[PDB]
Amino acid sequence: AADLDTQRSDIATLLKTSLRKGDTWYLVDSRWFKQWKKYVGFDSWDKYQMGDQNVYPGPIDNSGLLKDQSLKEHLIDELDYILLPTEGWNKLVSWYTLMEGQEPIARKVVEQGMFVKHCKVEVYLTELKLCENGNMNNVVTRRFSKADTIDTIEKEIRKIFSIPDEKETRLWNKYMSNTFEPLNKPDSTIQDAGLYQGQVLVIEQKNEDGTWPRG
Amino acid sequence: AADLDTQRSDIATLLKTSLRKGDTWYLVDSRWFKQWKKYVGFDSWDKYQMGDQNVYPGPIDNSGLLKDSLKEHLIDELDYILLPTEGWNKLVSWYTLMEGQEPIARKVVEQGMFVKHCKVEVYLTELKLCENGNMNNVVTRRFSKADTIDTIEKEIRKIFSIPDEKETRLWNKYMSNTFEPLNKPDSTIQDAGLYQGQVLVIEQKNEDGTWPRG
């Protein structure tokens, strides 16, 4: 076995281990653990029997969490068991053994991705430079919120250059000199579209012909 | 004005005010704000000049933050602190706003952020799986809540030896015999509203190009 004081020290430390999707963690019946906590004096409120061999936990016993080898339903962490990382687990078995006729209870970490909405004070509105294929020198500046959509913008350009509700158009994002990317997701927000301060947007009007002025 | 102890504490809880989309907050130059702090004993480790005129902030001055009109790459907390409407008015009513100056009002914007939550998955989700032509031939698998409809379909395809060539579609079949189409391959089992013991049915397109269920 080990020094009783390092047993609690090391385990105390391993319990802090951070969850990494994929890693394997093991279950330990909360009852056995308590026998082990009492006997190692883990808690500052029950560290009064460490050493007593009448509170020797013996082999690790997980049978409480088991109906068959099959995990009882509605089990709650720190309630019916605690969890340990590969390391801290092996350390426990190498001090006490695993009660013959039982296989370890291994489970995996699951990661759930999600898009949270958070509020910030928009100190800088995104400043765009707007113009039209006809006259590239007539640049008009507008400031939008990052939460504003492309649609909100296209409609603003339309209004600025008095483009008819009935005329078809397309919108181009000018990322770098001589480089044009379409902006064809009306409902995309400025943030989601990756438009940044000072960016040039070019609107193109469809010819009375059907053809586009740019090709 | 108001006494220093209340100025400090008033402003202190106001700073903790919550960010609500559409709300208006006001910028204050850190230069002025650091002075106010010292003048009011805001920071507890720095109360030594509390009430000295040496550190009397003055009227509120944001000209540091302007060009001759907002300077770029200002940082929050470093160049400026932000105050709710009420906190602003208080400061103005205490030291007012320097002449030739307007407040710097900005609004709360809401924005997306991708975060990841992790846990030990103690109980996997059990599903029943079958091929549409054969309903009585049911096979159970246990999946992770993180698995996708696509990952599940692939698995089912193996179980029933459905060569890739065959196109397939997937259904959640309810006790009522309602067939719900699972047609978002990238939804996780959870995001797809799939639950322990539910029944999934894989349907193969006919050779002639028609679907069994139409």
CA distance to partner chain B, nearest, from residue A77 (Å): 9
Q: Which residues contact B91 (CB under 8 A, 6 or more apart)?
A: B11, B28, B36, B60, B83
| Contact (CB, 8 A) for B102 and A55 | no
> Chain A window 148-187: which residues touch B at a Cβ cutoff of 8 Å?
none
Strand partners, B202: B131, B170
Distance CA B105, CA B23 (A): 10
Cβ density class A114-149: b for 16+ within 10 Å, e for less: eeeeeebbbbebbebebbbeeeeeeeeebebbbbbb
Q: Which two tokens stand for residue A32?
A: 């056995």
* Tokens 């106001």 found at: B14
Q: Tally Cβ neighbours within 10 Å of residue A204.
A: 18
Q: Which residue of B has its CA nearest to A24?
A: B120
Q: Which of A78, A108, A106, A80 is nearest to A15 (CA)?
A: A78
Question: Helices B85-95 and B4-14: crossing angle, nearest 10°?
Answer: 160
Distance CA A132, CA A140 (A): 10
A146: nearest CB among B74, B106, B109? B109
Distance CA B212, CA B182 (A): 16
| Contact (CB, 8 A) for B130 and B157 | no
Quick check: helix, strand or coil at residue B43? Answer: coil
Q: How far is CA A11 from CA A91, A105, A122, B113, in A?
A: 8, 18, 46, 35
Cβ contacts (< 8 Å) between A27 and chain B: which residues?
Answer: 122
Quick check: helix, strand or coil at residue A19? Answer: coil
Distance CA B209, CA A38 (A): 69
Q: Which residues contact A74 (CB under 8 A, 6 or more apart)?
A: none
Q: Tally Cβ neighbours within 10 Å of residue B142.
A: 11
Quick check: helix, strand or coil at residue B4? Answer: helix
Q: Which residue of B has its CA nearest to A105?
A: B122
Provide the total of helices (H) and of strands (E) in chain A, helices listed first.
5, 8
Quick check: helix, strand or coil at residue A89? Answer: helix
| Contact (CB, 8 A) for B114 and A115 | yes
| Contact (CB, 8 A) for B17 and B84 | yes
Q: How far is CA B185 from CA A36, B39, B179, B182, B214, in A?
A: 47, 61, 17, 8, 20
Q: Which two tokens stand for residue B52?
A: 């000295």
Reported CATH class of domain A114-215? alpha beta
The structure was resolved to a resolution in Å of 2.6
* Tokens 């349907």 found at: B203
The secondary structure of A54-79, three-state, reads HHCCCCECCHHHECCCCECCCCCECC
Distance CA A200, CA A3 (A): 69
Q: Which two tokens stand for residue A53?
A: 């061999």
Distance CA B88, CA B104 (A): 10
Q: For chain A, state the CA radius of gyration.
A: 33
Q: Which residues contact A144 (CB under 8 A, 6 or more apart)?
A: A125, A126, A128, A152, A153, A190
After which residues does chain A become discontinuous at a C–N distance over 2.5 Å? 68
Quick check: helix, strand or coil at residue B75? Answer: coil
Q: Which residue of B has its CA nearest to A145?
A: B109
Helices (H), chain A: 4-14, 30-40, 86-96, 150-160, 190-193
In this structure, chain A runs to a length of 215
Q: Which two tokens stand for residue A155?
A: 């409609």
Q: Which residues contact B5 (CB under 8 A, 6 or more apart)?
A: none
Distance CA A186, CA A164 (A): 18
Q: Which of B107, B88, B75, B82 is nearest to B27 (CA)?
A: B82
Distance CA B25, CA B85 (A): 6
Helices (H), A68-180: 86-96, 150-160
Quick check: helix, strand or coil at residue B73? Answer: coil
Quick check: helix, strand or coil at residue A109? Answer: strand
B1 contacts chain A (CB < 8 A) = no
Cβ contacts (< 8 Å) between A117 and chain B: which residues?
Answer: 110-113
Cβ density class B147-170: b for 16+ within 10 Å, e for less: bbbebbbeebbeebebeeeeebbb
Do the chains contact at A110 and B144, CB–CB below 8 Å? yes
Q: Which residue of A has its CA nearest to B148?
A: A112
- From the options 2.60.40.10, 3.30.565.10, 3.30.2230.10, 3.50.50.60, give the CATH code of B1-123: 3.30.2230.10
Q: Which of B119, B136, B131 is nearest to B161 (CA)?
A: B131
B82: nearest CB among A112, A116, A121? A121
- Strand segments, DSSP code E, in chain B are 24-29, 80-84, 105-121, 125-131, 134-143, 168-173, 179-181, 199-204
CA distance to partner chain A, nearest, from residue B172 (Å): 23
| Contact (CB, 8 A) for B24 and B106 | yes
A123 contacts chain B (CB < 8 A) = yes
Distance CA B29, CA A148 (A): 28
Q: Which residue of B has its CA nearest to A71?
A: B123
| Contact (CB, 8 A) for A99 and A59 | yes
Distance CA B198, CA B148 (A): 15
Q: Does domain B124-214 have CATH number 3.10.20.90?
A: yes
Q: Which of A44, A40, A49 is nearest to A10 (CA)?
A: A40
Which of B26, B80, B118 is most worth mutating to test chain A (most A CB atoms within 10 A of its CB)?
Answer: B118
Q: Give the DSSP letter of residue A133.
A: S
Which of A110, A118, A144, A197 is most worth mutating to test chain B (most B CB atoms within 10 A of its CB)?
Answer: A110
Do the chains contact at B112 and A108, CB–CB below 8 Å? no
Strand partners, A196: none
* Tokens 């639950």 found at: B195
Cβ contacts (< 8 Å) between B107 and chain A: which residues?
Answer: 121-122, 145
Instruction: Delimit the CATH 3.30.2230.10 region(s) of chain A.
Output: 1-113
B77 contacts chain A (CB < 8 A) = no
Distance CA B172, CA B182 (A): 7
The order of strands in the sheet holding A169-176 is: A140-144, A126-132, A200-205, A169-176, A179-182
Cβ density class B107-116: b for 16+ within 10 Å, e for less: ebbbbeeeee
| Contact (CB, 8 A) for A46 and A37 | yes
Distance CA A20, CA B188 (A): 19
Do the chains contact at B146 and A116, CB–CB below 8 Å? no
Do the chains contact at B110 and A147, CB–CB below 8 Å? yes
Helices (H), chain B: 4-14, 30-40, 85-95, 149-159
Which of B75, B107, B109, B125 is most worth mutating to test chain A (most A CB atoms within 10 A of its CB)?
Answer: B109
Distance CA B88, CA B14 (A): 10
Superfamily for the A1-113 domain = DUSP-like (3.30.2230.10)
Q: Which two tokens stand for residue A62?
A: 């997980």
Instruction: Delimit the CATH 3.10.20.90 region(s) of chain A.
Output: 114-215
B78 contacts chain A (CB < 8 A) = no
Specify the experimental method: X-ray
